[PDB]
């Protein structure tokens, strides 16, 4: 077992991002293998626990009364294991809103049931977590092209409702991906593809956009970057590990008390961009949080 087994997971190395590979089929050496989880712990509790363990090492902006929205929080079990972990990880006072296509009971402050396309919000968010996946993706009948559906919504949501300095964690797989989403990673101070050690036998990964700058810092071709991700997964077998789960002493996210300022597009210079790039500043309104779900009416 390499020192990676003791980390919560593995991040795509910079040298793989700079390649220009063609999209190949993903063929993992350990595909299907299952990790040994602590007695009575659900896979999604373990998965979100490692994701949060990794987010702790990043320059996330963490202000008082932080605003977090979690898409795809439901399960076929009717509960939200991932939301329970986010509630445990986020500082007390943090507003947590979750949503899913199907009904479910959550520990979130507010839950919206319905297609994410029907979810509207006046205010901006500091952190967006998406674990949305369409089960129809399992029907591979043609080439692996960029998918739309909820990804179309997510790209628009990030560009319009993500606060500057805010971060994102979007779940993707070999076939559940979008080219415009990879291009948006270039609008952050830093980004990566993160694989949890408990689900290392899956093409699953979380695209992490760290510190939103609102403009393209890097020019990214989505089709090329997804091919680079598959090439990395095909050439780097990750050993399944749940070792990071046995140490929860440093788990809670530290409240950095990051400053929140309501600036206009004219008051954004290089001085401000460098503060956004270190999670030292959040730029958005600080009004009351209002969310709504559209209801289509049929006779």
């Amino acid at each position: 077992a390499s020192s990676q087994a003791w980390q919560p997971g593995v991040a795509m190395p910079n040298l793989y991002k700079m390649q220009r590979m063609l999209l190949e089929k993903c063929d993992l050496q350990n595909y299907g293998d299952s990790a040994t989880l602590p007695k009575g712990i659900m896979m999604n509790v373990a998965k979100y626990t490692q994701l949060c363990q990794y987010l702790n090492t990043l320059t996330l902006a963490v202000p008082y009364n932080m605003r977090v929205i979690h898409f795809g929080a439901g399960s076929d079990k009717g509960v939200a294991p991932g939301t329970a972990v986010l509630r445990q990880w986020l500082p007390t006072g943090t507003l947590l809103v979750d949503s899913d296509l199907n009904d479910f009971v959550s520990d979130a402050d507010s839950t919206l049931i319905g297609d994410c396309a029907t979810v509207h919000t006046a205010n901006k968010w500091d952190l967006i977590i998406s674990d949305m996946y369409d089960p129809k993706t399992k029907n591979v009948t043609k080439e692996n092209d960029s998918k739309e559906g909820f990804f179309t919504y997510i790209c628009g949501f990030i560009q319009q409702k993500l606060a500057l300095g805010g971060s994102v964690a979007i779940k993707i797989t070999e076939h559940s991906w979008n080219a415009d989403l990879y291009k948006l990673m270039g609008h952050f101070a830093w980004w990566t593809a993160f694989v949890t050690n408990v689900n290392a036998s899956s093409s699953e990964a979380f695209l992490i956009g760290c510190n939103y700058l609102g403009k393209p810092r890097e020019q990214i071709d989505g089709y090329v970057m997804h091919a680079n991700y598959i090439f990395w997964r095909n050439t780097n077998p990750i050993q399944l590990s749940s070792y990071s789960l046995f140490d929860m002493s440093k788990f809670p996210l530290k409240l950095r008390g990051t400053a929140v300022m309501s600036l206009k597009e004219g008051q954004i210079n290089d001085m401000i961009l460098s503060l956004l790039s270190k999670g030292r500043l959040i730029i958005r309104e600080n009004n009351r949080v209002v969310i709504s779900s559209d209801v289509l009416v049929n006779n």
Binding site: P38, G40, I41, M42, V45, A46, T49, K77, G78, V79, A80, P81, T83, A84, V85, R87, Q88, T92, D103, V105, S106, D107, A108, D109, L245, M248, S249, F251, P252
Partner: protein, 114 residues
Amino acid sequence: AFAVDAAKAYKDYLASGGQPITNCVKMLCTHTGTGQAITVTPEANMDQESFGGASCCLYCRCHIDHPNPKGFCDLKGKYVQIPTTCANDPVGFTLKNTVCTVCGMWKGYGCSCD
């Protein structure tokens, strides 16, 4: 008005050999907590297991009105600590047992105010 008593209906369903409500979300924690019954964060001790509130609430899980006036839930958004020997049925445990108003521990499983 006809009130659908689900609190006793479950005690009857169990007592007559029934499958306890599963998929209660158990959390990962150090097991070095206060050991209090309901907390804002997992506070399980070496003898307990912490679970997400919503997953252990009979009313939330069955999608029915909450007894507390206004429909306010005492578990949603919190974490309930359950003795390891009773962790096979967290829902049944929260109903039967009661919380001490002084120390905030379970009566008969941690409350020593007498």
